[PDB]
């Protein structure tokens, strides 16, 4: 009932995101836990409704990948007055993640997640 | 053929142990071995002292891996190469599922800082890199 999920941070649909998702799904599957797929937006006046729609499509796509890979997945759109890396890091701590999976190209978001996470961070090319 | 977990270690510490423990669990879960690697420049830069210390760390590290219910292998790399490149090339050579590495390193004042070898490994690796604090 109480598991430690794999947290995967997704920005957009891409081949890199798929690779990140498939690695995450294999971890989750091996450990018997779900994957939590996260996308962060600033909210407040900074977030349009158009932004929420695209994020939701990306997340819906991401979770379909996880599931197709034989893992349980859940979508979490974070709209919290935060920037992505703090959101990802705070989220991972809030759900007691086993690890955070992110794509790298570092990239600004990735470097702050690497440096600030209190969890293992798994970097996928 | 298996794809091993590769884990890089420098010195014996409670931190290196956290890295080994995570690497060992990855390996357990996947039914693969852990390859413990340590890199040394060789030639004029490496003293016998460094070899002996390297070998003692590797042995200690394999033991931690084994204690955690995984198989370990010691791989001391002495190739005239800089450590990030050694680690990255080795992981490609062995077709690792992932590299596990400690991203913090002690500065000369005793304070842990973001390691530059670890940083370079994360940036250069072709394999997934699992970053442990
Ligand atoms: N806004 C937002 N929400 C969720 N996940 C994100 C966001 N921006 C980037 N990312 C993820 C996408 C990659 O997996 C990783 C690298 O971002 P990089 O910018 O290349 O460092 O961070």
Residue numbers in the entry:
A (entry chain A): 1 to 105, 115 to 134
B (entry chain B): 2 to 134
What does the paper behind this entry write?
Universal stress proteins (USP) are widely spread proteins in nature. In stress conditions such as heat shock, nutrient starvation, the presence of oxidants, uncouplers, DNA-damaging agents, or other stress agents which may arrest cell growth, USP constitute a natural biological defense mechanism. Under stress, USPs are overproduced and through a variety of mechanisms aid the organism in surviving in such uncomfortable conditions. Here, we present the structures of both apo- and cofactor-bound forms of an euryarchaeal USP AF0826 from A. fulgidus and a bacterial USP NE1028 from N. europaea.
Based on this observation, we hypothesized that soaking or cocrystallization of that protein with ATP could result in formation of a crystal with the ligand bound in this region. As a result, we obtained the structure of AF0826 with dAMP bound in the vicinity of the ATP-binding motif. All of the residues binding dAMP in AF0826 are analogs of the residues binding AMP in the NE1028 structure, and interact with the ligand in very similar ways, as shown in Fig. 4B and D. Where hydroxyl groups are interacting with G and A (AF0826: G103, A9; NE1028: G114, A10) and adenine ring is positioned by either V or S (S40 and V40, respectively). AF0826 displays the same type 1 dimerization, the dimerization interface is formed by β5 and α4 from each monomer as it takes place is case of NE1028.
